[PDB]
Amino acid sequence: MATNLRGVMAALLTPFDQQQALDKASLRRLVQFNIQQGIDGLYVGGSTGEAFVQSLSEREQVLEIVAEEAKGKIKLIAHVGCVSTAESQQLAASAKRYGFDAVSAVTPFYYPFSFEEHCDHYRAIIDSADGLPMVVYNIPALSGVKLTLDQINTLVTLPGVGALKQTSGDLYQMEQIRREHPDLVLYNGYDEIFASGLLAGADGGIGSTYNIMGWRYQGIVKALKEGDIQTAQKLQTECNKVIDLLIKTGLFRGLKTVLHYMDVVSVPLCRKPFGPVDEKYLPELKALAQQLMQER
Amino acid sequence: ATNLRGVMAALLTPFDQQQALDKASLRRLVQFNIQQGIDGLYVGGSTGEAFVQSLSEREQVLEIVAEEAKGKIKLIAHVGCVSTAESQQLAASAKRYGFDAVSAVTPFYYPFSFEEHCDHYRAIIDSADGLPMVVYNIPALSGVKLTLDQINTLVTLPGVGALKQTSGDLYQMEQIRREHPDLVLYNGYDEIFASGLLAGADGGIGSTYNIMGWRYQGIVKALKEGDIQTAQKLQTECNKVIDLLIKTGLFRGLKTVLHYMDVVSVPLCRKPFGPVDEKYLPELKALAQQLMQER
Amino acid sequence: TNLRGVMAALLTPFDQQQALDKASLRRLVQFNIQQGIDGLYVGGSTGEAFVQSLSEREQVLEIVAEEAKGKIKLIAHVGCVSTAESQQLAASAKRYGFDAVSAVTPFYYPFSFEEHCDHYRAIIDSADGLPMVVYNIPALSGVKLTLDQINTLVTLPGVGALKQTSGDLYQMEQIRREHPDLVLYNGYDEIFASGLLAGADGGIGSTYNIMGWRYQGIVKALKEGDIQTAQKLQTECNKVIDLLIKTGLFRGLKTVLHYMDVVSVPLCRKPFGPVDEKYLPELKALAQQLMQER
Amino acid sequence: NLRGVMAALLTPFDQQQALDKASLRRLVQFNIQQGIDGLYVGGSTGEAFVQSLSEREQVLEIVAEEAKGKIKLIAHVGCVSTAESQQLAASAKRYGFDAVSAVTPFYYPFSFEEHCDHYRAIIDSADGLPMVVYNIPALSGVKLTLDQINTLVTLPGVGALKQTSGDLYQMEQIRREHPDLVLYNGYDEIFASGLLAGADGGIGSTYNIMGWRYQGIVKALKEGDIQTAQKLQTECNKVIDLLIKTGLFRGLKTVLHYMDVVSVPLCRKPFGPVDEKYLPELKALAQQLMQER
C-alpha cells in the first residue's frame, strides 16, 4: 500500500484564470475534489495538464502545489517528460524534492529519435529521479512514436522502471505485455475502453475523465472483481456516453467546463491555440454536471 | 437457435499437393468443427483463401459445406468480391444451396465512394433473395476505413442482419452496440475475443476456432456466469497459440495443426503463400497434441 | 529496341450491360496509336482488370494484340493476388505476342517479401522470355516496400523495368542512381515532368488516352532544355486531372472519349457508379478542347 | 523580396550542451560568404524544440547582429503555445528580422479554425513582419488539405509558404492557385523537381554545407540546362543519403566541425553522437566540399 502504484489515478487538469495564468485556488480545489471522490492518486503535468503549452517553471509550480495539497493522502505521479532530456531531468529532480511517489515521461516527440536514443532518454531521467520509479508513457496517437512489442518490453525492463501507462487501444498488445510482465503495473490509457482494458490485463488506469466521474471507474474495478459483468458494462456505457460528448466539445475544455458547473473550476478555459467551448454544447455540459453531482 | 448470434469458425480450404481442392479433407474439417460444438461456419472469407480462388472454386466449397452441415449448424456464405456482379453470382448460389445468410467484405483495391459501397451491398442483398446480409468491416486487409456514422448506415440497410467487426477498436465496438441494441455483432479478432464480448459483441467469427473452438465457447460461458478469471485464463491460452500461429503464418499454421490432428491431409496454402518453415513443426505438432488431449 | 517511352494505360470499354464492347476497344487502341503513343499497358488498374475474370482479361489481351502488335509496344499486366492465375495470364500474353508482362504486388493478404519475390519469379517463368515490369503502387495495393526491397525486385532474373506509381521523387532519384540502365516508368501523371527530371525515363498513365501528345510534348521539351514549355504542358495536364479526379478518373476518361466518338457507352463496372450529370458540360467542353488542340 | 535559397540554420552547442556563441557567429558568416540569400532561424534545424524561449531569443538576437542588412532573415517563432509564439514574434520584430514563420502547432489535435486563429495572433504580434506558413506533416503530424493550405496562405499578413512536403502534385496546385506566392521547397532531396513543379526557391538544412549547389540548380533550370540541374541534384542526394544515415543535424554539424566552423559537433539530448563508423565518410565529404568551393 505504501509503495503500490497500481490503481485508478486521474490525469489532472490545470485551471487557468481569465488571463491564462495558473488559478491556484481552483487547482487546490480540483485536487481536493479528486481526493474526495476516492481516487487512488493523481498523474500531474501530463498531456491533460496542458504541460506542453506551459514553461518549465509553470510545470514545477503545479507539481509543488499539488504535493502540498495531496502528499501523503494519495499517490502522486509527476509527468516530467519534455522533448529535451535536460529539461526532463530538471523536472525529475524537482519531483523528488517535492516528495512525489514516481515520475513519468512521454516518448520524446516531433523529431525522429532512434530507439536507442529513447532508451538513453529514459535512463537519464531515471538517474535524475534518484529513487522514484519511472512510468514509461506510450501514446502513439499524440507523440507519433510507434513502438513494437519488443521495444516496449525493453523499455519496461530498464532498471528503475516500475510501470507503463498504455494509451493504446490495441488490447492484444495489452494482453501480451501482461503475459510478458506479470508483475508490471499497467495503466489503461483510453477511458472509453477501461473495462475491456482491465480484462485484457491492465491492473489500473490513468485518465482525464476521472476528474468528473472517477467513482464510476472505481466501480468498474469492483464490479469485475466481484464478477458482476452486467454492472461493469453498464458503468462503461455511461462513461462512454460522456466521452462521446467530451470529444465533440473538446476534451480538456469540456472537462473544465463541467468542473466549473460543479463549483470546482472558476474559469474553464484552456490555453491558446485551444479555443473556447462552442455555446451550443453548454446545455448538455450543464445537464451532465447536474447529473454527476446527483450521482455522487 | 432461431438467430445468427454465436461462435462461428471461419472455415479453411484444404488443398492437395497440386493446390487443388481436397474434398475429403474439407468434409473432415466441417465435421471436425461440428463435433467441437461450434455454432456455425463462415465460408468463403479471407480464411478460406477465397481471394486466390476462382468464382467457381468458391462455389464448389459452398456446395460441399452445405451438403455436410446444412441443418446441423448455421452457415454464412461470404460472397464478397471487388466486383458487384461476381458477388451477386455467389449470393444467388448461396441461396440455392440453402445457406442461412450471406456476407461481403467492403470492395477493395479501387477507392469507392460510400454511396457506391452502399449500392454494392444493396445489389448483393437483392441477389441473396431473402438471406440476411452480414456486413464485413476489416480495414487492416481491405484498406477501407469507415466512420461510425457510415457503419451505422450500412448495418441499417434493408436486409442487413449482422456485422462482422474485424477491428481492434473496442470504443467503436461499444458505440455500435449502444446504437444497435439488437444487432448481431461478431468479434473479428480472436486475440481480443473476451474484451470484445465485454465491449458489446455478442459472438464471434474466427480462424483459430478451427483448432480450439471450445475455448471461445468457454469464454462465452465464463462471462455469462460472471467468472472473469476463467475468461481471462482462456483468452491467455488462446493468445499463446495465436502468437505462435502469427509467427508461423496463420492459415498454414492452422492447417498444419489440423494435419497433426489427422483432419487435413496436406497443410498447404495457395501461392503466393509459402510453406511453413520446418523449424516450427515441433511446436505445431506439440500444440496439436496438447489440444487433442485437452478435449 | 527497348521498352522506354510513354505508354497509355488502356481502359476497357463496356456496353450497356457491363459486357466488353469489342468495337469500342478496337477504336480506343487505334485512337491511341494515332496520338503517337509509344505503347499500351493492358490489363492493369485502369482496364478494370480487378473486376474482370481471367477469361475476360485474356480476351482483352488477345484483341489488343490483333490491333496493335507490331505497331507499338505492348505490355500485359497479368497480375492477380493468386500466383497461379497470374501465371495463366502470363502464358497467354506470351502466346499473343506481347513485348512484356507486368504484375502488381499481390494485395489484400499480407505476404512476406520472400513470398513477393517468389511470386514474380513464378510469373516470369510462365512469361517464357517476356521481360517483367515490376509494379509498385502502394496507394492501391497497401504494400509498402523499402528502397532495398525495390532494388531486390528490379534485379530479379528476368525483370526489365519498374512502373513506379509513387509520388516520392527522392526514391525515384535513388532508384535511377542505383540502376542507371533500368527502364523506369513514372506512374502519377500529375507529376510527370518532375518525375522525369528526378530520373524516370518514360511513363505509363491513364490520362494518356485523351492527351498522350501532351506527355510526349513534355518529354521533347525537357530533352531540348525548354523548361517553361514543359511546365506549361504539365500545368494543362493537371487542370484536366483536377477535373477527372473530381468526376471519377476512369468514368471521366471514358466520358471524354465518348464525346470524342471513340467509346460508345462510358460506363465502368459496378461498384463503380455513373458520372454525376452535373459534370457533363465540363467533360464535353474538355473533349472539344482536346480535339481542337490535337 | 523573400524569394530565394535560404539555409535553415543550425545552433552550435558546446560540450556541456550550452549555446556556443562564437560558433553561431562563425556559421552565420560562413553562410553569408558562400552566397546564401538568407537564413531561416529557430526552426527544426536550429533544435528549437529542445530549447527554451529565452534560448531561442538569444539565438535570434545574435544572428540579427551578425547578418541584418546583409542577407534576408526569417525567424521561426513557432511553438505549440500561441502566447509563446507571440513573444518570439515580438522579439523578432525588435531584432529587425524581415519575416516570421510558424510550424502548425503540434502534439495536441487542433481544429483548422484554431490553427487559423493561431496564425492570426502571431501575425498581429509580428507587428508588420510578413508570415511564412510552415507545412511539415512528417514532423508535426498535422495533415492539411489543399483548401486549408489555400485559406492559410490567403490570411492577411501571410507572404510565403515553406512547403516541406514531397507531394509535387500539391506543389503544382498551390502554384496554380497562387501565381505570386513565395513558395519554398522544403525537402532538399527533391529541390530540382520541386522548382519544376512550382516552387520558386527553398529553405534547407543541407544548404549550410553546399548551398552553392542549390543556387546552381536554380541557375541551371533558368538557363534550360537540365543535364547540369540533374547532376547537381544527384550529387546533393549522395550527400543527403549519408546525412540521413548519420543523423541529419549532427552529420551537418560534424562536417562543419571538420571545416573549422563549428567547435563542437553535438546536438542536444536525446539526440545522440555520431557513430564513429561514419567519421571517415564525413571527413572525406568535408575535404571534398572545401576543395569544391
mmCIF file of C-alpha atoms in Angstrom, chain D residues 167-274:
data_model
loop_
_atom_site.group_PDB
_atom_site.id
_atom_site.type_symbol
_atom_site.label_atom_id
_atom_site.label_comp_id
_atom_site.label_asym_id
_atom_site.label_seq_id
_atom_site.Cartn_x
_atom_site.Cartn_y
_atom_site.Cartn_z
ATOM 1 C CA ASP D 167 3.738 15.835 -52.820
ATOM 2 C CA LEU D 168 4.616 17.637 -56.042
ATOM 3 C CA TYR D 169 1.056 17.428 -57.350
ATOM 4 C CA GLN D 170 0.019 19.619 -54.429
ATOM 5 C CA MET D 171 3.070 21.842 -55.025
ATOM 6 C CA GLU D 172 1.820 22.484 -58.564
ATOM 7 C CA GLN D 173 -1.753 23.034 -57.373
ATOM 8 C CA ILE D 174 -0.557 25.621 -54.859
ATOM 9 C CA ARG D 175 1.402 27.475 -57.553
ATOM 10 C CA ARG D 176 -1.601 27.356 -59.890
ATOM 11 C CA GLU D 177 -3.914 28.877 -57.276
ATOM 12 C CA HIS D 178 -1.345 31.468 -56.124
ATOM 13 C CA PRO D 179 0.743 32.813 -59.063
ATOM 14 C CA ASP D 180 2.665 35.335 -56.951
ATOM 15 C CA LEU D 181 3.150 33.326 -53.757
ATOM 16 C CA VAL D 182 6.686 32.906 -52.410
ATOM 17 C CA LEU D 183 6.871 29.103 -52.231
ATOM 18 C CA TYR D 184 9.872 27.411 -50.579
ATOM 19 C CA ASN D 185 10.687 23.786 -51.404
ATOM 20 C CA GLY D 186 11.331 22.095 -48.046
ATOM 21 C CA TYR D 187 12.872 18.724 -48.934
ATOM 22 C CA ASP D 188 16.388 19.300 -50.276
ATOM 23 C CA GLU D 189 16.429 15.864 -51.901
ATOM 24 C CA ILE D 190 13.759 16.868 -54.447
ATOM 25 C CA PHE D 191 14.773 20.523 -54.911
ATOM 26 C CA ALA D 192 15.115 20.357 -58.708
ATOM 27 C CA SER D 193 11.771 18.583 -59.114
ATOM 28 C CA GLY D 194 10.160 20.919 -56.587
ATOM 29 C CA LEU D 195 11.173 24.013 -58.545
ATOM 30 C CA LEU D 196 9.899 22.439 -61.768
ATOM 31 C CA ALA D 197 6.556 21.762 -60.061
ATOM 32 C CA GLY D 198 6.165 25.376 -58.948
ATOM 33 C CA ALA D 199 8.392 26.280 -56.002
ATOM 34 C CA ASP D 200 10.368 29.485 -56.600
ATOM 35 C CA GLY D 201 13.065 28.867 -54.025
ATOM 36 C CA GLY D 202 13.785 26.784 -50.969
ATOM 37 C CA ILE D 203 14.787 26.515 -47.329
ATOM 38 C CA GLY D 204 17.005 23.618 -46.298
ATOM 39 C CA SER D 205 19.445 22.423 -43.670
ATOM 40 C CA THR D 206 21.948 20.966 -46.133
ATOM 41 C CA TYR D 207 22.368 24.470 -47.585
ATOM 42 C CA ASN D 208 24.760 25.096 -44.669
ATOM 43 C CA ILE D 209 27.456 22.944 -46.299
ATOM 44 C CA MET D 210 26.673 23.135 -50.023
ATOM 45 C CA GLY D 211 24.233 25.973 -50.644
ATOM 46 C CA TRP D 212 26.011 26.898 -53.883
ATOM 47 C CA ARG D 213 24.829 23.614 -55.417
ATOM 48 C CA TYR D 214 21.204 24.583 -54.882
ATOM 49 C CA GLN D 215 21.909 28.056 -56.263
ATOM 50 C CA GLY D 216 23.454 26.153 -59.164
ATOM 51 C CA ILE D 217 20.283 24.163 -59.758
ATOM 52 C CA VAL D 218 18.231 27.370 -59.827
ATOM 53 C CA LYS D 219 20.608 28.812 -62.429
ATOM 54 C CA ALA D 220 20.698 25.609 -64.481
ATOM 55 C CA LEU D 221 16.906 25.332 -64.744
ATOM 56 C CA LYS D 222 16.647 29.028 -65.602
ATOM 57 C CA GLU D 223 19.129 28.515 -68.440
ATOM 58 C CA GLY D 224 17.447 25.338 -69.650
ATOM 59 C CA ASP D 225 20.456 23.202 -68.744
ATOM 60 C CA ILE D 226 18.547 20.180 -67.433
ATOM 61 C CA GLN D 227 21.624 17.935 -67.531
ATOM 62 C CA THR D 228 23.511 20.202 -65.123
ATOM 63 C CA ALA D 229 20.474 20.526 -62.858
ATOM 64 C CA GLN D 230 20.138 16.741 -62.595
ATOM 65 C CA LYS D 231 23.845 16.193 -61.972
ATOM 66 C CA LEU D 232 23.826 18.741 -59.155
ATOM 67 C CA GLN D 233 20.712 17.214 -57.598
ATOM 68 C CA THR D 234 22.278 13.756 -57.857
ATOM 69 C CA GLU D 235 25.387 14.953 -56.015
ATOM 70 C CA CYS D 236 23.218 16.600 -53.366
ATOM 71 C CA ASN D 237 21.339 13.341 -52.861
ATOM 72 C CA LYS D 238 24.525 11.298 -52.491
ATOM 73 C CA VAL D 239 25.256 13.637 -49.584
ATOM 74 C CA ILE D 240 21.715 13.552 -48.215
ATOM 75 C CA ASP D 241 21.762 9.725 -48.261
ATOM 76 C CA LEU D 242 24.816 9.876 -45.989
ATOM 77 C CA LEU D 243 23.474 12.566 -43.661
ATOM 78 C CA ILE D 244 20.211 10.687 -43.088
ATOM 79 C CA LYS D 245 22.290 7.600 -42.258
ATOM 80 C CA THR D 246 24.464 9.509 -39.785
ATOM 81 C CA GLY D 247 21.653 11.640 -38.395
ATOM 82 C CA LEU D 248 20.928 14.873 -40.264
ATOM 83 C CA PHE D 249 21.722 17.694 -37.825
ATOM 84 C CA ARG D 250 24.707 16.020 -36.156
ATOM 85 C CA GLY D 251 26.051 14.964 -39.545
ATOM 86 C CA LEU D 252 25.890 18.537 -40.796
ATOM 87 C CA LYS D 253 27.472 19.825 -37.591
ATOM 88 C CA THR D 254 30.265 17.261 -37.903
ATOM 89 C CA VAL D 255 31.039 18.336 -41.482
ATOM 90 C CA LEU D 256 31.044 21.974 -40.354
ATOM 91 C CA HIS D 257 33.353 20.992 -37.492
ATOM 92 C CA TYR D 258 35.901 19.478 -39.872
ATOM 93 C CA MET D 259 35.586 22.713 -41.878
ATOM 94 C CA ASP D 260 36.623 24.527 -38.671
ATOM 95 C CA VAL D 261 33.345 26.456 -38.477
ATOM 96 C CA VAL D 262 31.695 24.584 -35.578
ATOM 97 C CA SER D 263 33.802 23.900 -32.461
ATOM 98 C CA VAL D 264 31.751 21.016 -31.038
ATOM 99 C CA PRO D 265 29.511 18.937 -33.364
ATOM 100 C CA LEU D 266 26.997 17.838 -30.730
ATOM 101 C CA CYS D 267 23.201 18.079 -30.802
ATOM 102 C CA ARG D 268 21.205 18.285 -27.566
ATOM 103 C CA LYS D 269 19.977 15.101 -25.866
ATOM 104 C CA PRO D 270 18.001 12.987 -26.686
ATOM 105 C CA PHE D 271 19.977 13.310 -29.938
ATOM 106 C CA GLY D 272 22.976 11.011 -29.582
ATOM 107 C CA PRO D 273 26.501 11.462 -31.000
ATOM 108 C CA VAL D 274 27.560 10.364 -34.486
#
